[PDB]
Amino acid sequence: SGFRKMAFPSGKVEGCMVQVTCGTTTLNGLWLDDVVYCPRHVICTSEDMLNPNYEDLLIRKSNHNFLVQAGNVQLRVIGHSMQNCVLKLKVDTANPKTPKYKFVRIQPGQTFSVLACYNGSPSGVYQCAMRPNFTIKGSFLNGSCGSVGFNIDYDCVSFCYMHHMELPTGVHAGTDLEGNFYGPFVDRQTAQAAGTDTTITVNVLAWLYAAVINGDRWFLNRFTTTLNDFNLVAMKYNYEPLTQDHVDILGPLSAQTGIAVLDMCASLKELLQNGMNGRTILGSALLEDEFTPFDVVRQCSGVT
Amino acid sequence: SGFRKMAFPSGKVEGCMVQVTCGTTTLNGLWLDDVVYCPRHVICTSEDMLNPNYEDLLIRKSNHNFLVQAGNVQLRVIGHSMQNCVLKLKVDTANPKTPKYKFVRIQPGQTFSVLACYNGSPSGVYQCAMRPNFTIKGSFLNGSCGSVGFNIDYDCVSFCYMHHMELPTGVHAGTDLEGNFYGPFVDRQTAQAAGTDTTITVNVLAWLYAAVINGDRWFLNRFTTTLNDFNLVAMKYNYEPLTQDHVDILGPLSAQTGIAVLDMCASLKELLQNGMNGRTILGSALLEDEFTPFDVVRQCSGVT
Ligand SMILES: O=C(Nc1nncn1C1CC1)[C@@H]1CCOc2ccc(Cl)cc21
Ligand SMILES: O=C(Nc1nncn1C1CC1)[C@@H]1CCOc2ccc(Cl)cc21
């Protein structure tokens, strides 16, 4: 028993991290097969960032300007191209440590592990969720750009995020591995509105099920609710509206604990209306929304 | 910016994980050089666990009874010995993926990453602290025994914990890599008292400094306190008494933010006496004690 904010083991990703330097800018790249992926802003100086013309800036660069280093060994760049906000540096050597991998665009509300890196070196790993507003609340300092988010299914690493920037509000923004930003963000030093964020209701319900499985049941009550009534409360408390698709995804956890989804919804409604009253659920004094129903099942059945 | 409960990258540890089977029991082992380390209770059946005579149980085992598997390849056991609560299985092959490593006995209140494993396969990684009462609050299911806790300093992995058991209270207990239990625990299925636990005061102060560095300052106030006065409040709220050694370890964070340690102590005293009042600090609605002052400095300066 026990339930923790668990990251995927990062080994397969560590073997893909490289350092990319262009001019005076150094950040991280992801080396898969014979391509290194990195944020295109590696080609900007600090002054270029107000409003960079990336197509023009990239035209002044040649393959020999992109210094790619994997640990201590230097990679030979034989091509470069910009795809949305990422650069693809073709190298003459396929990464011998390339795992089975896929590039995926995750949905808001889904979770992933981030391997935070500096100068191509892994610093740490943490699990987070993509907020409904397409930002992530990470831990990223200058030089962390190019760090990636991923999930693993057996031996296949699905890369879903590459880190690009910190908005003036301290929240984080990045792209899929085809360089498409999640959300409305652009890779320029300008104030940018992140939309209204909401709490990921299906994740909070999943975590309440994780709580019951792991011994915490104080919040269970004698009530039930309906999707309509629960969504009125979800509206008031800035929670994502619950749908039958969300209810279906909670099916396995509802079957495992014997607590109907709408009965768990009534517990959540009471917690929203009354708070925790100085109590905790799985070491938390707030309603946790960074575990999907899949994460709860995977953690509770010990999937390797 | 941003502050997360970050684990060390687990790659170097993943390469050391093996599956050890003895009879009908399977758990994890740590393969370093030509030795595999695992909990001695791999030699018990479920019935042996009430009160096992480990010396007698081990006498009925030969090297050929310990099945050690690294991924798909089988290791040849050429020796076995019990050291406290761990077995050391000498194998004929040194692990080619053995990193630079040390075995260390951590102090209560220190933190470490756990790589949770099942059948020799890594499932996830999370950071936790050794409680003042020598238990850990992990996420461990049947078969997770043998999973290890560690810290990394550049390229050296200091292994500090090997998981042995879950107490009837749902908390976790384990040993150092020489098989000495942390705390009063014994590897037998019997009810065992974990001592009175306390909150790790120096860690909460470190995390309050991490909060200030990362933009959260609502809790800062116009007051100060003394070690004596703060310790009266620490006593009442079951916090570890603060010493000048703790104050010295917070020196770097006090110098970085310009907030004297006793002034941060007055903020903590007000938070203890009045609560958060429905507010949060770094995404938490309670006072976090799983970040040491070293973790805060390391996270805030991007150490790889
Ligand atoms: O955000 C950036 N780096 C970053 N990403 N996570 C953390 N950090 C550092 C600032 C704390 C760079 C520097 C600031 O100016 C910009 C502007 C646009 C872009 Cl794409 C990147 C950047
Ligand atoms: O605790 C144990 N395994 C374990 N450790 N973390 C999680 N879990 C499973 C139970 C949930 C085993 C089985 C229970 O009985 C015992 C008794 C003594 C010893 Cl050393 C190990 C064990």
Spans of all domains in chain B: 1-14+100-197, 15-99, 198-301
Residues within a 6 A CB radius of ligand 2: A 1; B 41, 49, 140-142, 144-145, 164-166, 172, 187-189
* Direct distance between the N- and C-terminal alpha carbons of chain B, in angstroms, rounded to an integer: 16
Which is the catalytic residue, given B22, B128, B145, B265? B145
Interface check A238 vs B, CB under 8 A:
no
* Nearest Cα residue to A226 out of A199, A258, A266: A266
| B71 vs A201: CA distance, rounded Å | 39
Q: Which residue has the tokens 């009530």?
A: A223
Q: A295 near A256, Cβ under 8 Å?
A: no
- The ligand minimizing its distance to the Cα of B49 is 2
Distance in Å, alpha carbon of A272 to nearest chain B alpha carbon: 12
The technique by which this structure was obtained is X-ray
- Go through A47-81 and write b for each residue having 16 or more CB atoms within 10 A of its CB, e for each that does not: ebeeebebeebbeeeeeeebebbbeeeebebeebe
Q: Do B125 and A166 touch (CB under 8 A)?
A: no
Contact A125 B10 (CB under 8 A): yes
**Which residue puts its alpha carbon closest to atom 21 of ligand 1?**
A165
Phi, psi at A277, each rounded to 5°:
55, 50
- CA–CA gap between residue B287 and residue B260 (Å, rounded): 19
CB contact under 8 A, B6 and A126: yes
B7/A125 Cβ within 8 A: yes
Q: What residues in A contact B276, CB-CB < 8 Å?
A: 285
Residue A231: phi and psi, rounded to 5, are -65, -25
Report d(CA A282, CA B147) in Å as an integer.
22
Q: Which CATH architecture has domain A198-301?
A: Orthogonal Bundle (1.10)
Which ligand 2 atom is at minimum distance from the Cα of B164?
20
Top mutation candidate among A43, A165, A180 for ligand 1, by most atoms within 8 Å of CB: A165
Domains B1-14+100-197 and B15-99 share a fold: yes
Whether chain B has a CB inside 8 Å of the CB on A15: the answer is yes
C-alpha–C-alpha distance, residues A52 and A200, integer Å: 35
The CATH number of B15-99, from 3.50.50.60, 2.40.10.10, 3.90.78.10, 3.60.20.30, is 2.40.10.10
Q: Please state the CATH superfamily assignment of the domain spanning residues B1-14+100-197 in this structure.
A: Trypsin-like serine proteases (2.40.10.10)
- Chain A residue nearest residue B137, CA to CA: A2
Ligand 2 centroid from CA A115, angstroms: 31
Rg (CA), chain B: 21
B162-181 residues touching A, CB cutoff 8 A: 166, 170, 172
Q: What is the largest CA-CA distance in chain B?
A: 69
Tokens of A255: 């079957």
- Looking at the partner chain, which of A123, A139, A304 has a beta carbon nearest the beta carbon of B119? A304
CB contact under 8 A, B139 and A299: yes
SS3 at position A259: coil
Q: Which two tokens stand for residue B79?
A: 């020796």
Looking at A16, A22, A38, A41, which residue is catalytic? A41
- CA distances (Å), origin B35, targets B32, B63, B78, B121: 6, 13, 10, 18
Contacts of B278 (CB under 8 A, 6+ apart): A275
Instruction: In whole angstroms, give the CA distance from residue A19 to residue A118.
Output: 8
Tell me how far apart the alpha carbons of residues A289 and A130 are, in angstroms, rounded to a whole number.
10
- Closest residue in B to A165 (Cα) is B1
Chain B neighbors of A118, CB-CB under 8 A: 302, 304
Subunit contact B125:A8, Cβ cutoff 8 A: yes
Give the Cα separation of B88 and B83 in Å (integer). 7
Name the token pair of B179.
């098989």
Read off the amino acid at residue A277.
Answer: N
Ligand 2 center to B167 CA (angstroms): 7
Catalytic residue among B16, B22, B38, B41: B41
Q: Ligand 2 mean position to A233 CA, how many Å?
A: 42
CB pair distance less than 8 Å for B121 and A285: no
The amino acid at A81: S
For chain A positions 180-219, those within 8 Å of chain B (CB to CB) are 214-215
